[model samples]
Target: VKLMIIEGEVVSGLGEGRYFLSLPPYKEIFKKILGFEPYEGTLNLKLDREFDINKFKYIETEDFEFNGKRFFGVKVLPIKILIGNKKIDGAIVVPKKTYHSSEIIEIIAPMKLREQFNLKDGDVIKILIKGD
Candidate 1:
């Protein structure tokens, strides 16, 4: 299978990702799907163009409640991202109901990408969609 490459720029988020990723329901599913528990937070990528996810396989999640509010559901796709020489396995998390869309891809990895890659805002990176 041929690998597909998508480029994007790193951006700052409100730091709400950790709170979500740390939730019991999300964490449990991520571990089962991705083969590891993700780091406490997520890495926000601002793509040059919106991602076309039609070709990727995604998993649907059940609704869960947090902080007395109910989150509808999610669609998660497994992906491996590349930064410089480093290639990290991660996932693209898309909420069924969200303010953001494919323009902003939230990635979760077992490793802390920012620390591993020494990344900062505005840095560009490429994501490698692995060949099956």
Candidate 2:
């Protein structure tokens, strides 16, 4: 079963620039003592090892935030699933609880993808969760 990860809150956009993930000196303390970590946005999606790609259209993301102590990170709230105005029915959102070293994916969705798709604030979509 596939599930959607949903979060909700006030949203904002980061200014245009190249953001980089860092490994500063406090990283060890953050991980070991403080527990400050990187970020990831994934749905509660569960499938067999593999599945059909054509079944998904677009993964919609908006309403984002970043919560951190020292190193700022971004969090996209209410991350949803939509395909042509239809949210995935009963999509099983799987658990997302990990930040292994070097496994974090920094989202750099070219501003063009959203503009090309005409995605606007409050517009919802369902896209294939990459290779879904």
Candidate 3:
């Protein structure tokens, strides 16, 4: 296995991850694949440069509908990270259609990461990515 590390700053989002993760279809699939029900909201990270997502293993969900609207598919990459001496298990979620740029990464975990870590905007953090 190869390991890669990327650093980013904590940022705020428009609550899109919270809404998407709350969808029944997405939540069910995520739980089955990730082995846990992800927290409704995501931790937004603004990277100094775009990280290569293709280097890691990822789970892709099928397109589904909610409330008479069609939603696009998403990709999730399970990862282990470290922040301020704390190690966390989480996944990076990438939506097919999103308002974020390549430098923005959305992370979801079994717990509310932001609240658990007391993260604030502009806090620099590092993610340890293990690739198979």
Candidate 4:
């Protein structure tokens, strides 16, 4: 398999991913797909250029309702990311409805990436995509 690298800076989000990932249904589905229980929040990345999501393999969630609100399906792209000297497995989450632009990506891991990596806003990191 070939590998592709994308570099982006750490940024803050509106806490939407935290709410979504905390849902029991979403957590269960993510566990089955990613083989691990994901952390309740996501790491936001602001890329230098727009990222093309079509080149990688991804898994998507089915739409489900919670609290009388309908939530749209989201795509998850399994990937590996480098933070400092550590390489961690994670996923890029793309919501059908989003306030983010093409250059912003949301990532979820088994643990709190920001705290674990000591990441702060404006920090740069590299995401590794494996070609199918």
Candidate 5:
């Protein structure tokens, strides 16, 4: 088995995902890809170093409209995150048209990881991804 490891720290993000992930289109697309419904918010990670993310598979979403504006989505890669002794299923998401750099990564899973693991800002975590 092949694996890709990513390490970063937990951080806070703009509370916009609760609204975004609730959209029917998002749920439909994510459920199809992830095989489970994603939680309403994202877990933001701030990498300790700059790394190339070109090796991962990308799941692209077609352009769509919302709030009367056209929006193009992303190319996300599914991954299994290892936090301490726990193995959590998650996905690495990157918007196709994003302003963020490699230093930032957004992860999505089926549960509120912070609440489930008693996590807080500044905590470091490692994610292990299976090569596609």
Candidate 6:
């Protein structure tokens, strides 16, 4: 794998279905890319990349190749990469809700990717792509 400095804050649902922010190395990468100091910007949510996960509306495509895994939607945030003809597809882990057999709290990680990620029946993972 090739590593290039990427500067930007990363926000995610942390698979637990809750949002997380203020990651490190962002200030550095941002300075490099923007050619300026990391002033302000919600790097992750600057734009709603994924279709409103709340609305449950995802785009469909003839996305070919790769193992057939179902997804509600796929988006490429700014500063994301463009793999040439090569493509990489992996599991997208999301937070899942836990139940007390009666308690209702929150749910995030969809059942599909969680299972593929070998996560617990109720454990939630971040809704971000694994770096590698």
Query: Per-residue lDDT for 1-132 in model 6, tens only?
Result: 332222211232223322211122333332333332322222122122322332332222222222453222222121221123322232211112322221121221112222333334333222332233
Task: Residues 1-132, candidate 2: write the lDDT tens digits.
Answer: 565332321112432221312334322322332243322122222222233222444222222223453333322222224435544321211112222222122222212323444545444344333222
Q: Write the per-residue lDDT of candidate 1 for residues 106-125, one digit (tens) a residue.
A: 78789879888889989988
lDDT of each: 0.77, 0.29, 0.82, 0.84, 0.77, 0.25
Q: Clash totals for all models, in order?
A: 0, 16, 0, 0, 0, 12
Give the alpha carbon lDDT tens digit for every residue of 47-130 in model 5: 977644566666776666877866666566888878898898888876654456678888888988888888899999998778
RMSD of 6: 17.6
lDDT by residue (1-132, candidate 3, tens digit) is 688788989998878445458888888888888788888988889998876466567888888878888887688888876878788888898877678778999888889888888889999888877875
Kindly give the stretch of ten consecutive residues in candidate 2 with the minimal lDDT sum.
89-98
lDDT of 2 at 102: 21
Model 6 lDDT at residue 23: 23
Best by lDDT: 4
Look at candidate 6 and tell me the lDDT of residue 67: 41
Which candidate wins on TM-score? Answer: 4
Stretch of 10 with least lDDT, candidate 1: 12-21
In order, what is each prediction's RMSD in angstroms? 2.5, 14.5, 1.8, 1.7, 2.2, 17.6
TM-score of every prediction relative to native: 0.82, 0.25, 0.87, 0.89, 0.85, 0.17
Q: Can you tell me which runs of candidate 1 are displaced by over 4 Å?
A: 65-69
Looking at model 6, residue 86 earns an lDDT score of 26
Worst 10 residues of 6 by lDDT: 101-110
